[PDB]
CSV table of C-alpha atoms and ligand atoms in Angstrom, one decimal:
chain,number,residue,atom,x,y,z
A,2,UNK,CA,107.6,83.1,100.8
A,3,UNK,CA,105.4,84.9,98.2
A,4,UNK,CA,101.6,83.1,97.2
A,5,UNK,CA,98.4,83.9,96.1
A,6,UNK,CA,97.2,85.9,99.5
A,7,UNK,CA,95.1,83.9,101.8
A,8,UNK,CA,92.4,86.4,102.6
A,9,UNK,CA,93.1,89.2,100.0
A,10,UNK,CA,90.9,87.3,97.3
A,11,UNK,CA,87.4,86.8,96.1
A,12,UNK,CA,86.1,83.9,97.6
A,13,UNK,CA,84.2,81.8,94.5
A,14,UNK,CA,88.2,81.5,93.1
A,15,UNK,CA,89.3,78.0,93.8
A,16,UNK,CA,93.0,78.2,94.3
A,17,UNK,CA,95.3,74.7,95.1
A,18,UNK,CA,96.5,74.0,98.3
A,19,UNK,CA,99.9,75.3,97.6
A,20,UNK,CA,98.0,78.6,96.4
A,21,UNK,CA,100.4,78.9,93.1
A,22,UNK,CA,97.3,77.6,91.3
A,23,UNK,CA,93.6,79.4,90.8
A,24,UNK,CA,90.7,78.4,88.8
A,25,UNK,CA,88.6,80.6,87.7
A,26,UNK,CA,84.3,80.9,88.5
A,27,UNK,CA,81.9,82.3,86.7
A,28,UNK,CA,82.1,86.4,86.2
A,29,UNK,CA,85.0,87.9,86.5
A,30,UNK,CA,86.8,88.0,89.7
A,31,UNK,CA,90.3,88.8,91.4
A,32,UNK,CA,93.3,87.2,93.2
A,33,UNK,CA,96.5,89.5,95.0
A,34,UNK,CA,99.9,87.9,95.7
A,35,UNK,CA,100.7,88.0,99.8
A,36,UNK,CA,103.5,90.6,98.3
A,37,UNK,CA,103.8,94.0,97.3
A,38,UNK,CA,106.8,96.6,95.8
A,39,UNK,CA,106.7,100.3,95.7
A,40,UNK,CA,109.7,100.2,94.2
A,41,UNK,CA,112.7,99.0,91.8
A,42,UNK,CA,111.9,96.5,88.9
A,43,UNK,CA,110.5,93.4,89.8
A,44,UNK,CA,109.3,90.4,87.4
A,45,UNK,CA,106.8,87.3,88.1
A,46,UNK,CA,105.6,84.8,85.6
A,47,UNK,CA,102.0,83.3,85.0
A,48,UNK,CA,101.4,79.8,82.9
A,49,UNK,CA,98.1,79.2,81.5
A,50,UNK,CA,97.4,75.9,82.1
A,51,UNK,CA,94.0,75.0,80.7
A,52,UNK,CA,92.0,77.3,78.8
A,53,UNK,CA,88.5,76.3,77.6
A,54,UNK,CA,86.1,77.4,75.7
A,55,UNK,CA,84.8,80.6,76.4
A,56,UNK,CA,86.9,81.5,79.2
A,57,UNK,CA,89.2,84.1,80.1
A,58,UNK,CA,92.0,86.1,81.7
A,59,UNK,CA,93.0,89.4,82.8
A,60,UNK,CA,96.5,89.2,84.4
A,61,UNK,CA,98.9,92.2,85.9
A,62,UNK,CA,99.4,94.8,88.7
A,63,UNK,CA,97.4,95.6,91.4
A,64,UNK,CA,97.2,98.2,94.1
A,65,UNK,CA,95.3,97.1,97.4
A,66,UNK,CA,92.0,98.5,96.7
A,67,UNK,CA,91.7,97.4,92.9
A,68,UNK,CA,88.3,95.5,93.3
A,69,UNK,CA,88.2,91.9,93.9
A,70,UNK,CA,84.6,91.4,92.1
A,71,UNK,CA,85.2,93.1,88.8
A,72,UNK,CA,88.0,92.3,86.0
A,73,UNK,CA,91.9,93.3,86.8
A,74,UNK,CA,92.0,96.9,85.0
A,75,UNK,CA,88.9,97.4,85.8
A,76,UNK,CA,89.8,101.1,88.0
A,77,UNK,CA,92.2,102.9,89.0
A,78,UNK,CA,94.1,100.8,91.5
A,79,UNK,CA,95.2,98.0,88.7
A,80,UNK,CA,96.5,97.2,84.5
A,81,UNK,CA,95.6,94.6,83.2
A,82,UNK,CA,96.7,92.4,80.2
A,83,UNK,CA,93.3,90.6,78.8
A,84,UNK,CA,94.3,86.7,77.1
A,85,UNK,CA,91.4,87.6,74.3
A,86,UNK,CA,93.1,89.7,71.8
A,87,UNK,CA,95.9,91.0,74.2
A,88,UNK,CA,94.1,94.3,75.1
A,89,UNK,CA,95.4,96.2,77.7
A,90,UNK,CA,93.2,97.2,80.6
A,91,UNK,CA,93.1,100.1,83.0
A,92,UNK,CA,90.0,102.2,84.2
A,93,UNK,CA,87.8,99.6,82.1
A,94,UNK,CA,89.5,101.2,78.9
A,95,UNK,CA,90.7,98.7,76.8
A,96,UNK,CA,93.3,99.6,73.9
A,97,UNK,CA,95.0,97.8,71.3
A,98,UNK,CA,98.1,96.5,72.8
A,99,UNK,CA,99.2,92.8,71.3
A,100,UNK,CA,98.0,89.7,69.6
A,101,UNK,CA,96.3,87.3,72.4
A,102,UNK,CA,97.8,84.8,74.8
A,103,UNK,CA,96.2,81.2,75.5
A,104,UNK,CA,96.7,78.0,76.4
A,105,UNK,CA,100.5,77.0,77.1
A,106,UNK,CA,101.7,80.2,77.0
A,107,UNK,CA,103.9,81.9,79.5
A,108,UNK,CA,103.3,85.2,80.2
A,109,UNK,CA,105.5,87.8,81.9
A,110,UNK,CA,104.9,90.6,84.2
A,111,UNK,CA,107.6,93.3,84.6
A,112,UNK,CA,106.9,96.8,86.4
A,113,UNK,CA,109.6,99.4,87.1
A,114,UNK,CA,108.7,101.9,89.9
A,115,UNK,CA,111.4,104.2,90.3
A,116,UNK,CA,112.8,105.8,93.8
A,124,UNK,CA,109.4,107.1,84.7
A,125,UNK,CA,106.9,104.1,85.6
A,126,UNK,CA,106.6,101.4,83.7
A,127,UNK,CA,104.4,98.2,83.0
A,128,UNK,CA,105.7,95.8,80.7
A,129,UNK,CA,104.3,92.5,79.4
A,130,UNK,CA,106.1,89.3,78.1
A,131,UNK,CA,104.9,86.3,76.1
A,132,UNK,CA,107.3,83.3,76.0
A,133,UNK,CA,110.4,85.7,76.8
A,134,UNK,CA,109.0,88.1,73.8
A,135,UNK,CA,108.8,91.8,75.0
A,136,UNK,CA,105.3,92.7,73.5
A,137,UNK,CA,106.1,96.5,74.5
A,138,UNK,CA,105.6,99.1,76.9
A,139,UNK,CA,101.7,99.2,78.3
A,140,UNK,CA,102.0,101.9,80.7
A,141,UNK,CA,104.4,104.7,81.6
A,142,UNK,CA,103.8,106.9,84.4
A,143,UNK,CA,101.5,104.7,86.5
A,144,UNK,CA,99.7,105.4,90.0
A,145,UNK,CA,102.6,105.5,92.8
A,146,UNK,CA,101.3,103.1,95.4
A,147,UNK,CA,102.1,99.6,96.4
A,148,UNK,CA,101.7,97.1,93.4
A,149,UNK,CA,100.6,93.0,93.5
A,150,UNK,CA,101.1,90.7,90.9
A,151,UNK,CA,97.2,89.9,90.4
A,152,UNK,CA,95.3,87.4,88.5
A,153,UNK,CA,91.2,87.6,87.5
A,154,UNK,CA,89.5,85.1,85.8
A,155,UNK,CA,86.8,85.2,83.9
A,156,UNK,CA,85.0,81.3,84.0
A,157,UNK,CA,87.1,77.9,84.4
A,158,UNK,CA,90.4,78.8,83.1
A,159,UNK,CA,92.9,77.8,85.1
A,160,UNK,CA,96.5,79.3,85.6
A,161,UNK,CA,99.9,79.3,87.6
A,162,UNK,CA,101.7,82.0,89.1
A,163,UNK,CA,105.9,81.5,89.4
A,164,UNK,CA,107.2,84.2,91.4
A,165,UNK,CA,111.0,83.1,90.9
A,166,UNK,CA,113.8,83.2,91.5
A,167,UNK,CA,113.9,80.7,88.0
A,168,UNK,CA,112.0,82.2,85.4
A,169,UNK,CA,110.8,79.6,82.8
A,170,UNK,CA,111.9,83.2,80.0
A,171,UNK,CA,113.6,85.4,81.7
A,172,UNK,CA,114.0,88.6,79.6
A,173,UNK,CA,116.5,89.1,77.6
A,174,UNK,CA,118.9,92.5,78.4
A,175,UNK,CA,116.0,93.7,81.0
A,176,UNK,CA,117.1,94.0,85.1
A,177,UNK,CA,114.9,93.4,87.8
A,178,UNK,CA,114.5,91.2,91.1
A,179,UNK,CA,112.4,88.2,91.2
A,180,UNK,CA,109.0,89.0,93.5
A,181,UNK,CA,110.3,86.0,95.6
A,182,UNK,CA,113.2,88.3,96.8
A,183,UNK,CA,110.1,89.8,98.9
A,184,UNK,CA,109.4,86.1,100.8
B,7,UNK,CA,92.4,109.7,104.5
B,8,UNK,CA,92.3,105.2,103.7
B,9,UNK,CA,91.0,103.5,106.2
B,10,UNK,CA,93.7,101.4,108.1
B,11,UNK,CA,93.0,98.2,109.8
B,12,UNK,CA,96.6,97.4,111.1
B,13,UNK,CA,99.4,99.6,111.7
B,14,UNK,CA,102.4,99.8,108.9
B,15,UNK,CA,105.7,100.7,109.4
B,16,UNK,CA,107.2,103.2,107.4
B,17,UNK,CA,109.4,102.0,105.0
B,18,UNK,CA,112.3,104.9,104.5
B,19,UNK,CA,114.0,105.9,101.0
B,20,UNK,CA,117.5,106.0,101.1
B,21,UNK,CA,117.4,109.5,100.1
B,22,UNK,CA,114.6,109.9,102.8
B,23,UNK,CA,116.8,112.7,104.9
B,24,UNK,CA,118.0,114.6,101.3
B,25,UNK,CA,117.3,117.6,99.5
C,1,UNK,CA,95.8,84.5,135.0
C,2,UNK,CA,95.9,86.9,132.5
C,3,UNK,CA,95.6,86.3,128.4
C,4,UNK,CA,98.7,86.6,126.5
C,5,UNK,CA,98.6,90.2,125.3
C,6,UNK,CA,98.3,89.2,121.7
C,7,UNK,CA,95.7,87.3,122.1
C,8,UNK,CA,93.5,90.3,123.8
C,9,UNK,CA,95.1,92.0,120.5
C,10,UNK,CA,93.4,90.2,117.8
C,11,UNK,CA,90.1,90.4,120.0
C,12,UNK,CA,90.1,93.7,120.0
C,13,UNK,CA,90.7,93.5,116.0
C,14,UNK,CA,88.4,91.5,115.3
C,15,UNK,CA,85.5,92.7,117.9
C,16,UNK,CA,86.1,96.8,117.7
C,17,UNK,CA,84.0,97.4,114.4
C,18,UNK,CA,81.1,97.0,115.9
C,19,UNK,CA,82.0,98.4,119.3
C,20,UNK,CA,82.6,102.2,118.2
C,21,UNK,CA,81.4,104.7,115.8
C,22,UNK,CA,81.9,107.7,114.8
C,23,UNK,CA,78.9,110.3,115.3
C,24,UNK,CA,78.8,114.2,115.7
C,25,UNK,CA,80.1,115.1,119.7
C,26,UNK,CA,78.8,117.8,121.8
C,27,UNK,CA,82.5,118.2,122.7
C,28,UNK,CA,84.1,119.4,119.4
C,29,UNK,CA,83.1,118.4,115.6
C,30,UNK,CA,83.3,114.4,115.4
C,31,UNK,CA,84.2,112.2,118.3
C,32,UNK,CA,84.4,108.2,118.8
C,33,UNK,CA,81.3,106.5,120.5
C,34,UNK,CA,80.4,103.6,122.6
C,35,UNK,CA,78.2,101.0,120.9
C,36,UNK,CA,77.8,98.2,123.1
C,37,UNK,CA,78.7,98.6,127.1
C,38,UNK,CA,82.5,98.0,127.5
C,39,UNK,CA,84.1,96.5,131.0
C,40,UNK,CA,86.8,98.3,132.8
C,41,UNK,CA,90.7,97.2,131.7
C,42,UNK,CA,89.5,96.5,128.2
C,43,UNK,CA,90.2,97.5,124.7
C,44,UNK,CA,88.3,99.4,123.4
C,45,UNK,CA,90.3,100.7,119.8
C,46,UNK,CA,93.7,100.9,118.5
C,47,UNK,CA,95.4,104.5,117.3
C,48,UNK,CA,96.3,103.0,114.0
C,49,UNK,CA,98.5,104.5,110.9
C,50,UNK,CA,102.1,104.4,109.6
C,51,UNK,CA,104.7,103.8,112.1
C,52,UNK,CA,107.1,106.0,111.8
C,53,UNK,CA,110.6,107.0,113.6
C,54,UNK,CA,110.4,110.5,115.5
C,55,UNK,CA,113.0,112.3,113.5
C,56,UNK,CA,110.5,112.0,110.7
C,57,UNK,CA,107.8,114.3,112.2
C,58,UNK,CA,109.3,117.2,111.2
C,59,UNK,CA,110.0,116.6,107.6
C,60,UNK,CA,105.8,115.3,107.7
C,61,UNK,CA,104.2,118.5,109.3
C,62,UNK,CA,106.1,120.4,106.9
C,63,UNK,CA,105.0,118.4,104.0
C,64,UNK,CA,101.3,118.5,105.4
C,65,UNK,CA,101.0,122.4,105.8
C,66,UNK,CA,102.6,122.5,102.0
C,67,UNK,CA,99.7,120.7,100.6
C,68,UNK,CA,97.5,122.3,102.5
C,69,UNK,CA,96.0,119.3,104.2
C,70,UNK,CA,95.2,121.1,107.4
C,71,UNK,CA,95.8,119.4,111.1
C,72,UNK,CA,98.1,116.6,111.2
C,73,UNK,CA,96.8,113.3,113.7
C,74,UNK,CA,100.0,112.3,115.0
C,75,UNK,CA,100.4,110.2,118.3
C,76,UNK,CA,103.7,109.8,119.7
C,77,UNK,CA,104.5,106.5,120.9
C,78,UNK,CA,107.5,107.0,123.0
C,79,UNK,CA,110.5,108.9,122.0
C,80,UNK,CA,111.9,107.2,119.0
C,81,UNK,CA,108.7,106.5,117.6
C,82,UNK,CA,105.3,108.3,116.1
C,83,UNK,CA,101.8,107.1,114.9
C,84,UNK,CA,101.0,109.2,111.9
C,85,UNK,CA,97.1,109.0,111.0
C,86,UNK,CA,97.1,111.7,108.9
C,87,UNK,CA,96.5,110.0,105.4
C,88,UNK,CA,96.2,106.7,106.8
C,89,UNK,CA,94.5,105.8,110.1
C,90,UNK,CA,91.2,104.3,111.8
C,91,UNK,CA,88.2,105.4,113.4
C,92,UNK,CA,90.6,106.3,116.9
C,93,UNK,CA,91.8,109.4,115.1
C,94,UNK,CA,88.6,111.3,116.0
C,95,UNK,CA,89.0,110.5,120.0
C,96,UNK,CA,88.5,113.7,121.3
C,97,UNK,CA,89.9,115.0,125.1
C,98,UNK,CA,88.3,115.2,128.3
C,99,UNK,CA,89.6,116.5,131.8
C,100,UNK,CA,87.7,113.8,133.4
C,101,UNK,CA,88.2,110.9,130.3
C,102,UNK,CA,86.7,107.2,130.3
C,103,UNK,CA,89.7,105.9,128.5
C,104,UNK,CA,93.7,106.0,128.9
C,105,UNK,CA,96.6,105.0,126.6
C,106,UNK,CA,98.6,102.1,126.8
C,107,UNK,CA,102.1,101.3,124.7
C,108,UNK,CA,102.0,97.3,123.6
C,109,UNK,CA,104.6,95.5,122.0
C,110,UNK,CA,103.3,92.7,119.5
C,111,UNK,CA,105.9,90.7,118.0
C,112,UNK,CA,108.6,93.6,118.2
C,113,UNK,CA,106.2,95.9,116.9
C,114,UNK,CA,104.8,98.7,118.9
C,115,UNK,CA,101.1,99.8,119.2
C,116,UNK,CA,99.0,102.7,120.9
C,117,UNK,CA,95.8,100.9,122.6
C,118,UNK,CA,93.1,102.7,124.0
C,119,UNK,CA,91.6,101.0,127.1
C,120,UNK,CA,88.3,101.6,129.3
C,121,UNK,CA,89.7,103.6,132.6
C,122,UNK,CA,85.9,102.0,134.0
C,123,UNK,CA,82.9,100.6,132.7
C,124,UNK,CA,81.6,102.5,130.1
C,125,UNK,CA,78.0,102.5,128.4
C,126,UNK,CA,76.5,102.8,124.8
C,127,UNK,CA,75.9,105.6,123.8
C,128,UNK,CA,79.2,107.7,125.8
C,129,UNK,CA,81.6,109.6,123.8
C,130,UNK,CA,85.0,107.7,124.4
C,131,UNK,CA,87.7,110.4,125.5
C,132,UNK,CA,91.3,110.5,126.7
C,133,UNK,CA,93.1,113.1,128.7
C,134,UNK,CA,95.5,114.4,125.5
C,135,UNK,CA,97.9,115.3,128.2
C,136,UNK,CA,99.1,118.5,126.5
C,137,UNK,CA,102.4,120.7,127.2
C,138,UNK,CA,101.5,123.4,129.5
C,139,UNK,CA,101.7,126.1,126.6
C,140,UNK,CA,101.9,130.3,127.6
C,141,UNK,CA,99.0,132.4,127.1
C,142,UNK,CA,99.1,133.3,123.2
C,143,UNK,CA,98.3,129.9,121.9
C,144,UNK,CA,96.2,128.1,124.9
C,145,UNK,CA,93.3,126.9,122.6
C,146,UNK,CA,90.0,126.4,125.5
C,147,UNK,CA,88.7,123.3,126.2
C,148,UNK,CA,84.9,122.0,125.6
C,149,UNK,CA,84.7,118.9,127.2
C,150,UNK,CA,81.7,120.0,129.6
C,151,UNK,CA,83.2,118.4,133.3
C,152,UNK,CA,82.7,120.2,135.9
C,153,UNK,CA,86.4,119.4,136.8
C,154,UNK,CA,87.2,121.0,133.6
C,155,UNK,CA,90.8,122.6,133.2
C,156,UNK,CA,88.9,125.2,130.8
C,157,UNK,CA,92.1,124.8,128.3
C,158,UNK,CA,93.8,121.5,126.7
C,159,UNK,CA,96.8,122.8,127.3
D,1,SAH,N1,87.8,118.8,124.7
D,1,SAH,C1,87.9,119.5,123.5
D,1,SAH,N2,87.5,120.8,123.4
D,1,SAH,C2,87.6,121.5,122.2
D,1,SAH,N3,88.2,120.9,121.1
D,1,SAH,C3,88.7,119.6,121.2
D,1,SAH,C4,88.6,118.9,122.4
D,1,SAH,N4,89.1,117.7,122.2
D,1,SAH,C5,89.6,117.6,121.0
D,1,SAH,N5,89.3,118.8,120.3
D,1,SAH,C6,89.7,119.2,119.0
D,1,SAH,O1,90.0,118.0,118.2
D,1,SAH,C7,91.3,118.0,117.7
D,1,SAH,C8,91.9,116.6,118.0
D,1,SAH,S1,91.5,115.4,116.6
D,1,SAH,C9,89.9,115.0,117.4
D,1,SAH,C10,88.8,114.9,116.4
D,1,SAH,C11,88.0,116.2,116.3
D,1,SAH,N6,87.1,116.3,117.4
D,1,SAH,C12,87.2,116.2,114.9
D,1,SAH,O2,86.0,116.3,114.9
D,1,SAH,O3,87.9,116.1,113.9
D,1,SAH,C13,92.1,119.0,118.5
D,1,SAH,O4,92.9,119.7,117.6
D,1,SAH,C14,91.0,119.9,119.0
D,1,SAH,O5,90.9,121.1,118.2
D,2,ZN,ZN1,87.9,120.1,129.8
């Protein structure tokens, strides 16, 4: 079944025993999923659980060598959706996408790779709108990076705490 | 070319033998 | 006794790193080389890439010549299967061939997967160029590319 990989991860992460659960350290810094898709639609779900002061998150899609020391977006391989402001990250570019996401909230990670691209984001069921369109073909993670002790949890399915309204796809624990 | 540590298999398209 | 074959497996993954490099050869271009003295029967490196099914090879040289990728580093496993290293692969794709080779290749199944292993044919020494006998088709006289490996058993052509 899908978790937060065991070896694909920077190493000062802290991440629970039944690896659905990371805390974050320090500078920014990256964890994959054991799973991959290359393609269909496919949805996971992350829960911010704790939030403090001056911490952050950037939360998404990952290809296997999107770096594990730097924030998700930060190159090529990975987009990332930042919880300050709700920017949207890719190639360290970061653009007005939606309002921010905190403590509580339940975001939701939707890609469509098709055998036209898509990367989609979700707060509390919401569709925020489409972040990228014709993305990198490769193999894509659900990824999370943290930036200091924020701590959040990764649902992979089949139950979705929002599942989308009118919106298709396969849970990532279909992969498992 | 990446550098591969372990082998991977192929996964085919259904359309992998069409035009 | 022996040690289960995938427990020499994850050995050789784990220890092959530092065991060969990749250098310049005096046989052709780049070639794989001995870092640390290797014993006879061993591993020495896997032929790693994407596993693919035989009827595929076809469809892939075509592809490769389209895009003008040049030479494609294919190894066949048996007949229903191929190694493709082209865009994909490890250090083993640069192994070059010698009529009088160090190393052979061995088919190993691992968990119902298959895998090309190259093993020391004897004790080999740092600093030798690791080699393999390519084994080609006998091929006619317009395409018979000559052969550099510098034995004095040399066949003067690989295939
Ligand atoms: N003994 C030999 N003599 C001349 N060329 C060789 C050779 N063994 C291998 N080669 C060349 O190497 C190719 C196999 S791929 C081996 C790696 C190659 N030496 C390189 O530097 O990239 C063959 O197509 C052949 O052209
Ligand atoms: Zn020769």
């Amino acid at each position: 079944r899908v978790l937060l990989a065991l070896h694909d991860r920077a190493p000062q992460l802290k991440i629970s025993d039944d690896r659905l659960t990371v805390v974050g350290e320090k500078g920014y810094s990256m964890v994959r999923a054991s799973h991959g898709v290359r393609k269909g639609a496919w949805y996971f779900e992350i829960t911010v659980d704790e939030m403090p002061p001056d911490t952050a998150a950037r939360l998404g899609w990952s290809q296997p060598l999107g770096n594990l020391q730097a924030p998700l977006g930060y190159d090529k391989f990975s987009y990332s959706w930042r919880s300050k402001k709700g920017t949207k990250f890719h190639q360290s570019i970061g653009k007005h996408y939606s309002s921010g996401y905190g403590q509580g909230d339940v975001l939701g990670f939707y890609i469509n790779l098709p055998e036209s691209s898509e990367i989609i984001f979700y707060k509390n069921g919401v569709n925020q709108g489409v972040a990228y369109k014709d993305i990198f073909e490769g193999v894509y993670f659900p990824a999370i990076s943290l930036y200091k002790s924020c701590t959040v949890s990764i649902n992979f399915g089949p139950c979705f705490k929002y599942p989308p309204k009118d919106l298709t796809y396969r849970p990532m624990s279909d992969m498992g | 070319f990446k550098e591969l540590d372990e082998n991977v298999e192929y996964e085919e398209r259904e359309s992998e033998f069409d035009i | 006794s022996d040690l289960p074959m995938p427990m020499r497996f994850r050995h050789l993954k784990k220890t092959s790193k530092e065991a060969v490099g990749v250098y310049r050869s005096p046989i052709h271009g780049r070639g794989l080389f001995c870092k640390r003295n290797i014993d006879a029967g061993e591993m020495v490196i896997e032929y790693a890439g994407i596993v693919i099914r035989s009827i595929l090879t076809d469809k892939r040289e075509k592809y490769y010549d389209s895009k003008g990728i040049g030479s494609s580093y294919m190894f066949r496993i048996d007949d229903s299967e191929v190694v493709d290293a082209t865009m994909h692969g490890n250090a083993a794709r640069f192994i070059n061939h010698s009529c009088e080779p160090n190393c052979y290749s061995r088919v190993i199944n691992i968990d119902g997967q298959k895998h090309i292993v190259i093993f020391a044919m004897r004790k080999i020494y740092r600093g030798e160029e690791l080699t393999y006998d390519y084994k080609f088709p006998i091929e006619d006289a317009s395409n018979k590319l000559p052969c550099n490996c510098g034995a004095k058993k040399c066949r003067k052509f690989l295939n």
